[PDB]
Amino acid sequence: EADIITNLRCRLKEAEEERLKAAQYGLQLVESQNELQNQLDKCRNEMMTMTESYEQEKYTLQREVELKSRMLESLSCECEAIKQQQKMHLEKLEEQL
Amino acid sequence: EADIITNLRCRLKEAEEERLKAAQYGLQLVESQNELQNQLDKCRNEMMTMTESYEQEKYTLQREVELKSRMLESLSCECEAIKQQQKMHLEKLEEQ
């Protein structure tokens, strides 16, 4: 009956250490799970930040293009006109002579 | 000492149950690790694709601006030259 106790004490030791491994491993896993979560939250944040940053640069570049295109159109239409003016002169001068 | 035994039995029973529960949590955490782990990868992939597809749109637009700019600097010149050739003519004609 005291040989019962030494088996049980030996057994408790074993079990109390096993539980600790099992407990330690779980804690290691939780820390991983959380560092994974706090970096997924971080990923989602920098995604939104990026998107708005990109969409601003885009809009401002699309503005430049539109204006530059307006300018170019006007100027090209001017050059052509004021070159035609010069053509008309040539024509007239040659006709006259 | 069915007083000490009583307790020691219940103590083992506890450690046994508490190790299994931990074991159970471990499974769940691994499952929910892989799951998390995948959403992280998804996010990270979506980021890369967006970044690439945005820095390319950037390129095309800057190229446009550069080209258009060169062109307009050119026939900003031309236009301002020819307009002088007219003016100059005109004053010669005024002289005559």
Author numbering:
A (entry chain B): 2 to 98
B (entry chain A): 2 to 97
What did the published study say regarding this structure?
Here, we addressed the organization and regulation of Spindly, a farnesylated mitotic regulator of DD (605 residues in humans). In early mitosis, Spindly promotes recruitment of DD to kinetochores, the structures that connect chromosomes to spindle microtubules. This function of Spindly is enabled by the 800-kD hexameric ROD–Zwilch–ZW10 (RZZ) cargo complex, to which Spindly binds directly through its farnesylated C-terminal region. In conclusion, we have studied in mechanistic detail the basis of Spindly activation at the kinetochore and shown it to reflect a structural transition from a closed to an open conformation.
